């Protein structure tokens, strides 16, 4: 079924996803300038045709310059291509989408982006600091209203700016919200949410699957386990038992086994990696499958316990995880 030359999924609206893309965030201050724009060419030489990214993550520009760099040598076309940009929370306010998705293409260089989402459900005060907090500390919110955010993602997809609509780290109501939308003209096609071995969200991708949304995975291989966000509690995903067990079986390591589990289910996955070796390394994966009781065994690993909880924000009205999904 899926291959490495072909494993593109269909979307809802008529245009389709690469299941295995590269992310791209990585901590700021502890990056070499360049290391984005370099893994972003590695990747699709290795054959990656899927990118995700964001303008917050402050690399949108190396993004760009690498994906122009390889449609100018003639390895892709820019429709071989599928990007993922994102509309941070500072940026919800109706008036601002546009403006925002069209800052992202000017800093890409490049046309329309094949996916914009919403990043969050909660919307932060405007302005310069993606992340307002007073002299107290305290973190200033602003009111969310996501359907008319979504009315001006909308707009943007009318425009020709964005191929496909959707959505990250929505629960089950704010899906609902935007689902049942009056006079609703673009479905969400994906929700951008933290999946793997120990949180499988089975619920919420039953929830998608209903509405032909596809799961994209976030975090797919646990995280960097950076303690000044992630939650640390749980040991770490790639040295789990069972995955290095089954690795064994395989030939494989345990990122193949987490990344192979994910994609065989049908649900998008973004492992990030700046390494050489690595990036090839998660690309390997349509040369093996998992029998169904490995599939199994794997989801079985499930904690309901998340790498990204995001507790700083758990005040604000549309923070997503108090419920049950
Ligand atoms: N929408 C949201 O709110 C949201 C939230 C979190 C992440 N994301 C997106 O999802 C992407 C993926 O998540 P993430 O970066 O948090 O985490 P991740 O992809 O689960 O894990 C990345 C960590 O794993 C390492 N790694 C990669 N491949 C490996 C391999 N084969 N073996 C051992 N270690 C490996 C990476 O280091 P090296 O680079 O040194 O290999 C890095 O420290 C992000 O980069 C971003 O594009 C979106």
């Not at 899926?2 to 299941?19: F, W």
């Not at 071989?80 to 992202?104: Q, S």
């Not at 999946?195 to 929830?207: E, V």
């Not at 995280?223 to 040991?235: C, E, G, Y």
Request: charged share 25%.
């Amino acid at each position: 079924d899926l291959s490495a030359a072909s494993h593109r999924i269909p979307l809802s609206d008529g245009n389709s996803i690469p299941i295995i893309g590269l992310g791209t965030y990585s901590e700021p201050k502890s990056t070499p300038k360049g290391a984005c724009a370099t893994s972003v060419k590695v990747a699709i030489d290795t054959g990656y045709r899927h990118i995700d990214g964001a303008y917050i993550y402050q690399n949108e520009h190396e993004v760009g310059e690498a994906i122009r760099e390889k449609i100018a040598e003639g390895k892709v076309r820019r429709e071989d291509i599928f990007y993922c940009g994102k509309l941070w929370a500072t940026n919800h306010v109706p008036e601002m989408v546009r403006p925002t998705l069209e800052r992202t293409l000017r800093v890409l260089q490049l046309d329309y982006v094949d996916l914009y989402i919403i990043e969050v459900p909660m919307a932060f005060k405007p302005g310069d600091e993606i992340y307002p907090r007073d002299e107290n500390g305290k973190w200033l919110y602003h009111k969310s209203n996501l359907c008319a955010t979504w009315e001006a993602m909308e707009a943007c997809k009318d425009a020709g700016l964005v191929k496909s609509l959707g959505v990250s780290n929505f629960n089950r109501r704010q899906l609902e919200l935007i689902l049942n939308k009056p006079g609703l003209k673009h479905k969400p096609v994906s929700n951008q949410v933290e999946c793997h071995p120990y949180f499988t969200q089975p619920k919420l991708l039953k929830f998608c699957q209903q509405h032909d949304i596809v799961i994209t995975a976030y975090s797919p291989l646990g995280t960097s386990r950076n303690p000044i966000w992630v939650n640390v509690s749980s040991p770490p995903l790639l040295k789990d038992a069972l995955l290095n067990s089954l690795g064994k079986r395989y030939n494989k390591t345990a990122a193949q086994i987490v990344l192979r589990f994910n994609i065989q289910r049908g649900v998008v996955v973004i492992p990030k990696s700046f390494n050489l070796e690595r990036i090839k390394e998660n690309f390997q994966i349509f040369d093996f499958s998992l029998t169904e009781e490995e599939m199994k065994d794997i989801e079985a690993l499930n904690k309901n316990v998340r790498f990204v909880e995001l507790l700083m924000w758990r005040d604000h009205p549309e923070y997503p995880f108090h419920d049950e999904y």
